[PDB]
Design an enzyme around this catalytic site. Structure first.
Site, PDB file in Angstrom:
ATOM      1  CG  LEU A  25      -2.063  -1.065   1.316  1.00  0.00           C
ATOM      2  CD1 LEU A  25      -3.001  -0.770   2.293  1.00  0.00           C
ATOM      3  CD2 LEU A  25      -2.814  -0.989  -0.088  1.00  0.00           C
ATOM      4  N   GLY A  26       2.114   1.142   0.682  1.00  0.00           N
ATOM      5  CA  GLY A  26       3.070   2.255   0.745  1.00  0.00           C
ATOM      6  C   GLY A  26       4.220   1.845   1.592  1.00  0.00           C
ATOM      7  CB  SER A  27       7.237   1.495   1.409  1.00  0.00           C
ATOM      8  OG  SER A  27       8.799   1.570   1.656  1.00  0.00           O
ATOM      9  N   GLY A  28       8.355   2.016   7.095  1.00  0.00           N
ATOM     10  CA  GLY A  28       8.732   0.734   6.697  1.00  0.00           C
ATOM     11  C   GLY A  28       7.479   0.324   5.605  1.00  0.00           C
ATOM     12  CB  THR A  29       6.878  -2.135   3.185  1.00  0.00           C
ATOM     13  OG1 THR A  29       8.175  -1.722   2.658  1.00  0.00           O
ATOM     14  CG2 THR A  29       5.912  -2.506   2.280  1.00  0.00           C
ATOM     15  CE  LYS A  49       3.885   1.307  11.624  1.00  0.00           C
ATOM     16  NZ  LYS A  49       3.911   2.615  12.101  1.00  0.00           N
ATOM     17  CG  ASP A 136       1.619  13.649  13.760  1.00  0.00           C
ATOM     18  OD1 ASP A 136       1.182  14.759  12.968  1.00  0.00           O
ATOM     19  OD2 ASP A 136       2.250  12.881  13.094  1.00  0.00           O
TER      20      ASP A 136
END
Length: 302
Positions: A25-27, A28-29, A49, A136
């Site tokens: 999904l995205g990148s 840890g990875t 994750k 955040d």
């Protein structure tokens, strides 16, 4: 004074064999995948994750996520202590809200925007009830389950306050300045009311369909801009009613800012007549396996 009650949250440890990574999904990875608890005949869509500091920080994040339980806060299902630690959370198929509003800007109407404001304020109010300061909050840290249901994520900076503690005093860590209350920038002080400031910025991000706050202004200059009284501008779709709430979240006196529970009330009132409060072009037209079980229907004994 008042004392602290025990935190009896259960940290679930998952075996690597129970979950399957399907795609990145995205990148840890981060991977989208399925969690299949043995003998349970269920497949739960999950996000997976996958340095001693990094390990310590992901465990602190798992500890906070294991301690929260609310429909508008992201669900941790468990951790996997493989050579590389893995955090398993509910899959939020539409990704983060910031990217979502940027991608679907031409189809986001007033009803969606105001409902998201309500839901984020509900999740924050719950965190306040738990004495958790998020530190955040931002549109990048709200995830989209469906267009009608969003949840707060990213507890990497979050802190639990004691029963008699009003503030968290930070050390020197990196923190997103353009979302921070002035007292956090100047004095490293964080409270539920500084989260309210970040909430105002988050609302501004939504209401601009994902603009960058103070675009092209160096973070070093934000402190002085705020001290001189300047704030983020009124988004073109926003009536003065909506902008006033944003501005109130950016008062220098933290105790003069709205409370999350008041933000729920105010945006819920507006969500009953959304076109009175947001004036959007084309608002009228805008619109967004047998054993598969969403995490919200997979309840784990507490």
């Amino acid at each position: 004074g008042s004392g602290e009650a025990p935190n009896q949250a259960l940290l679930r440890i998952l075996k690597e064999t129970e979950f399957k990574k399907i795609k990145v999904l995205g990148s840890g990875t981060v991977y989208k995948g399925l969690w299949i608890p043995e003998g349970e005949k269920v497949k739960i869509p999950v996000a997976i994750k996958e340095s001693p500091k990094a390990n310590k920080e992901i465990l602190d994040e798992a500890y906070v996520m294991a301690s929260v339980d609310n429909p508008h806060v992201c669900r941790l299902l468990g951790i996997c202590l493989t050579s590389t630690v893995q955090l398993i959370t509910q899959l939020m198929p539409f990704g983060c809200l910031l990217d979502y509003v940027r991608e679907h800007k031409d189809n986001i109407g007033s009803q969606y925007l105001l409902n998201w404001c309500v839901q984020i304020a509900k999740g924050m109010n719950y965190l306040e009830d738990r004495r958790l300061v998020h530190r955040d909050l931002a549109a990048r840290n709200v995830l989209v389950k469906t267009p009608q249901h969003v949840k707060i994520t990213d507890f990497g900076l979050a802190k639990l306050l004691g029963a008699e503690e009003k503030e968290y005093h930070a050390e020197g860590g990196k923190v997103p300045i353009k979302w921070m209350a002035l007292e956090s920038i100047l004095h490293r002080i964080y409270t539920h009311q500084s989260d309210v400031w970040s909430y105002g910025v988050t609302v501004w991000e939504l209401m601009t369909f994902g603009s960058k706050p103070y675009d092209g202004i160096p973070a070093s200059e934000i402190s002085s801009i705020l001290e001189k009284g300047e704030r983020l501008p009124q988004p073109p779709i926003c009536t003065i009613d909506v902008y006033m709430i944003m501005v109130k979240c950016w008062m220098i006196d933290a105790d003069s800012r709205p409370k999350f529970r008041e933000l729920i009330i105010e945006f819920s009132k507006m969500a009953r007549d959304p076109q009175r409060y947001l004036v959007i072009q084309g608002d009228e037209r805008m619109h967004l396996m047998d054993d598969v079980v969403d995490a919200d229907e997979y309840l784990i004994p507490q």
